[model samples]
Target chain A: VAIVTGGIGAAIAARLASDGFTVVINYAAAEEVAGKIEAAGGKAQADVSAAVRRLFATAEEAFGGVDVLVNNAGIMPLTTIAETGDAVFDRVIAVNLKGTFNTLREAAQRLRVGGRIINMSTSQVGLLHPSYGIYAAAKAGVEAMTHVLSKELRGRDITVNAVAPGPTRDRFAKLAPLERLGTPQDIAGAVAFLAGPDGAWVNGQVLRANGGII
Target chain B: VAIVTGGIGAAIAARLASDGFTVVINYAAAEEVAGKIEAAGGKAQADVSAAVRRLFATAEEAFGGVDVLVNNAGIMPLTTIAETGDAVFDRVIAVNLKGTFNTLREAAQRLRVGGRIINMSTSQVGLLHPSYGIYAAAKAGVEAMTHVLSKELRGRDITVNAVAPGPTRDRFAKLAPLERLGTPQDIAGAVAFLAGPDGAWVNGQVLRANGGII
Candidate 1:
């Protein structure tokens, strides 16, 4: 399993590692931050896609090939389009959109048959909230890419799906019908479900793991 | 301004009529079922598309042009592909798919400048449950038409969207996390949102009112 960085990413990486996956944690600069996952038997590295390919090589070298890729690394600098600077906008697009694409492209060519790829998206894409326009737009593009890629990978048995989490404690909790925000474990459970064997028929879909406020 | 049929359709029609739309009730045979809505001051008729054009003519004739069209009449006779005869398959496709297209074509020509079209779909399209394959397939086509028509209606200031409901009292309530099937009023609220001013920005989208089961 490969995880992108941040709180949710760390939670997912650590959980998967504990669940017996040889996890590779990817961070752009704070590589040392994810080092905490070492306690969970995970490796921290710089490149998201590079980390994925390295894990692929390791799995191929020993077991055969990798089966799951989770693109959870993203930066959400919440600001409206007018308040956002060019650099912030570009960086968000580059990391959230291009970063997801980078790993997806790699997985497309190299993942084992019956592999699963799960991408992270925001519920704001559905809620259309203010201050999340740019970030949401980028993730929205990732969703469109996800749908197109699912069809693109036909006959490969490689299911491509996305998990769009709604307001968790870190985002918005009170807005959800459940009356509380979600935990990192809540988000991780959704990821694990998609990555597991049971979610095989769930293809070309975006599963919103919010408490159904939307 | 609207027409609703079937048990579910009657509920939406009643609710919308109560909410103050000059509602029209359409039924193939159970005219008395929807006739109850006339007491709430709504119109009753026999044909789905026929009711639509009649409303269109009335709106143009004297009642100020009609603006909203809700395609909520459909049949879901569960059967596998192998067991589905041609008559069964064709009726499902006709009522669920062609029925929607017929009204949409008329709305494209006659609805008020700033109109709204809300089509009914089933959550089974997403869940892909067994025995729902044919029904889901037809609704799937309706969804595809939804996206394309939204684009096609580009300068008309008219929004095209679909409402995909989960099991109602008679449909799959047990699957929902809320542990209850949706009510016609629940689905009607979604339609009213898209028809009103608040849902102005929501275009070419399918709002699933399924309690987060999928």
Candidate 2:
């Protein structure tokens, strides 16, 4: 019931809110956007570990307990390994890998039984495009954690997964095999599908939402 | 030149050597296996980073340069996350993850154009069975790095991938649609296929050699 408040995040928030979930927008610098979401009956908060904890606290207070923790917050700065600075490498890993881990670890303890954890990975992890080395590595770690945490939550019936989306309007848009970029809704649909009952059996998988880009 | 040696590594070395590759067997506490490989006109070395470097060095001395690195060394000690000790986790990560990273880092710098890097993973990564947590996590990292390194070597005409094989002898053999456990030769064939010219177009893939066992 939380959205990251980027382009894709906004769309996912809209879709999930409309689907009757109490959507909470987590934004770095999107106060106006959060207000917009609030006007539409969704909540908003700062984007940080403290704020994430509060968002879950609020959700549990309002809705009894969280059913899903959609770890859709990530940053992709494309740079080859040799060219990537240590700062960039660490930052990407901090956000994409460590951030996902923080939420997953917390959710593993906090979520009600039958809860789900969905992470955001990238199609570049499969496409193996140049300049995506560091980003891909971090996402790859996220994926490894996805598999590990799924088993770690054994007997709890919680599913852990990552959704690797292709370009929506980014620099990598042309790589899509469908010959056009994906809409935010396209990715939302994939996440929604995975968060639904049908995806119960598809645990610990990275669902590539890239329309055959790889 | 190609390097293949481990549990399934011997078969791959035998097959690739017969297939005309200057195969090098990397072994640990398996002196007889090395002797057997040498008897068959192949080479052998300890399964260490220095040994891998020496394998490439000897190949360079003889064949001008190394072209393929078959990273087929791994350990699979089954233990659930809570039950897995730090020593076991560290050992698995050291041998399975860091070992592959060390060689791939070296190969990225030294491999000739048209080089191939084939890592060994396990189908349990996707299978997500309990007690395989640490082992699966290690292989999952290998798979991730396989994809990232493939992109890192873009335009260099090198392909990086991992072959994830299921049980050759395990309780899960009955799950295979082929109704049989995998043979070392079966996995070796997949490796040979990946190392051959036909597999040039396939990059950054984790081909499941699980006999249709998901």
Candidate 3:
């Protein structure tokens, strides 16, 4: 249902799992990541996707079907578009480019009518500053993919959008990406939590279940 | 204060001017267009821009300044991006592209804080069906300009947005283009009108002046 990323991916996945999603995250800090979710009493596993492909299959069979796909993988390579060339560019393309493409392609084909696909982009595409060149290019492409594929799949009732965050502020946004994606029971669960003694320690908190920005 | 378009531009302009905006519209049914606004007791003039530049200058100098810019001009040339070639494409660019750019460029520089610049796009850009390629392409670019310039002008306290209507349904929507844009005594004026007999004629009419859609 969710895959949050870079190094802070664990924190995002932790939150999603805590929110009751059968979440997935890449395996760095594997034990601590799993332990956090487990201790919080949530379901999570180490993963991003032949890996993504298989993960989709596992989810469809075991969890019924995916309701969301969030692509937050990729490292930000520093360089100017002016200086971008063979070696550096390809790695950026390979990880950021292909990773998003592979997953988006898969989701485009597989997501049900109500499924959500959120791709990660950066605030820099518009910032267009110095060395963000390669990172921005690949993400720019991902952003384009989100748009073009969105129209390509028009009328499917599936939603396609990209989250472009500037920089830990983003770390805190781990819970926001797919919040725009879903249900009535969503509100009910939040209500159930707060309405019970189990939700007591949560007092005075703005218990948001709406995912991203209010 | 406004520029309404294609054919129904007059009706839209008439509404804006009636609601207390000094509007600009083009000459098509020039006389009737003028007559409607004149009879309704609103100010309007025929034009689009050497015209755009001059008008902005006029508004800034005489009218004190423009508060809104709505670009709703273009024809639905039937064609596809794949099949499009020389002649047909250029005309689309000339009118739809430059007309918009000329005005938007002016607005970007000239619009005061709290000003609005609304461009026209199409539901077809997302529709991406046959024969709409060229029109959609131009409009898609207009849409891009709206976004890029929006960010480019970020924090200027100005807003950049677009209206993309599908097709008289659109005719009816001429009223909706900039509804997302702005005021307050705005609603007050309506209440005042309804409180008086001048508003009495409005009776059950949804006397909306918020520019566009509800």
Candidate 4:
């Protein structure tokens, strides 16, 4: 069972589902959006916790246990430290860093030994964008926490790692220096590698998936 | 003025100080350990913060402001995650991580626009140590924070970085796993380079000063 969290995460969840895993779409809001996913012939659930737990339980109840947990829900709202007060900072941190922790923690507890945990971070962690300190700090903490948790779940055969993507063109197309940006497929490719057997040996690493721009 | 933080640090401080900068020796609980350096005609202060500020002020007062800030304080109290509790964690984090933060943050405010901030980390961040989770987490945070603050202090010309030493065999020979480990000078050389002109291109980086063991 697989769980995807963001609107763009549909690609990841769909990819996993097409790869023979049951997919669950977890969104913070807008169930109708995920409903569109279900209408598109894939399962989509709106309840984040229930969706996540359903995926884990489905794997456990149906296929022994979860083999892969992908922490891929984050937001970069294009705000600076001054522009981003406690309210914005809290929301971003909660969704980006802490949300990953929450899902990964549950995934670790429920996952069978030798499972893999893939966390989606950003190269902003390395680049340190001007108006994105809050996001970068949250991602930085994600990398740090991933390093810690990797050891904690060690010997259980669970390899937790993070993938930091560089600047990508999306809603923030205006800010991208390059007219073209890394696509969702680019990130999803990295995520697939992390969740697959090839990534078995890579543990607690923040593999830079950035296109060298950052 | 240069402030060095350990017994091994005294040697580097002495060498750098002998090169003409005023030196301040910052030690932990070991008094007689570092008092020897103080007696050697160099300025060795007892308090950490006082020593740091004194060095910064002396540089500013004497040489036009602090040019480099090196956090050389570290401790390897052998303990596993199970052996470590909040108390040990706090102590280790205080000296290793938070202490680095305290010094770096203070230095960020006082350092000249083109100054440098260097922190001592560990190669254990890469190596998955059995009982070194606390230390590793703290160092990992240092690495992450170094990357974060580097961007935060952008345009200041001050580069923030950390030197991660591998199994360094100093007076603590029993603490090392390798028969031949890193030298204190090996790490010091990296610090010196980071403080020099050639290192200007490097910023927010953790150059593992290990013997390639990791």
**For model 1, what is the C-alpha lDDT against the true structure?**
0.69
Q: Candidate 3 chain A: worst 10 consecutive residues by lDDT? A: A200-209
- From the highest DockQ down, the ranking of the candidates is 2, 4, 3, 1
Instruction: State the lDDT of candidate 4 residue by residue for A68-154, as single tens digits.
Output: 777777777865432344457456655675466557656757777877777888887777656555566567656766777787776
Name the top lDDT candidate. 2
Model 1 bad stretches (over 4 Å)? A1-214, B29-38, B41-55, B58-64, B169-174
lDDT of 1 at B68: 75
Candidate 3 local lDDT, B15-100, one digit each (tens)? 56767766655542756766777787876332442566676776677667777666766666774332444457556754665567
Docking class of 3: incorrect
TM-score for the A chain of candidate 1 = 0.84
All candidates: DockQ: 0.02, 0.22, 0.03, 0.15
Q: Give per-residue CA lDDT, model 1, range A43-88, as digits (tens).
A: 5444542454664565467656667788887888875433445467
**Candidate 4 ranges beyond 4 A from true positions:** A3-6, A14-30, A44-65, A74-106, A125-161, A169-179, A196-214, B3-34, B44-65, B73-102, B128-138, B144-159, B169-179, B183-186, B196-205
Q: Judged by lDDT against the true structure, how good is candidate 2?
A: 0.73
- Residues B1-214 of candidate 1 have per-residue lDDT tens digits of 6544445676676777777776655555345644676765755444542455665575566556667778887888976433455567557756775567566666767777777888888776676654575577567656655665676677879898989988764346666778777777788788888887899999989899878887
Interface RMSD of each: 12.9, 3.4, 8.7, 4.8
Judged by DockQ, which candidate is best?
2
Cα deviation at A29, candidate 1, in Å, is: 58
- Clashes (backbone N, CA, C under 3 Å), per candidate, total 2, 0, 8, 1
Candidate 1 backbone overlaps, count? 2
Model 4 iRMS (Å) reads: 4.8
Q: Among all windows of ten consecutive residues in candidate 3 chain B, which has the lowest summed lDDT?
A: B199-208
Off by over 4 Å in 3: A1-214, B3-6, B44-49, B169-214
| DockQ of candidate model 3 | 0.03
Per-model chain A TM: 0.84, 0.86, 0.69, 0.80
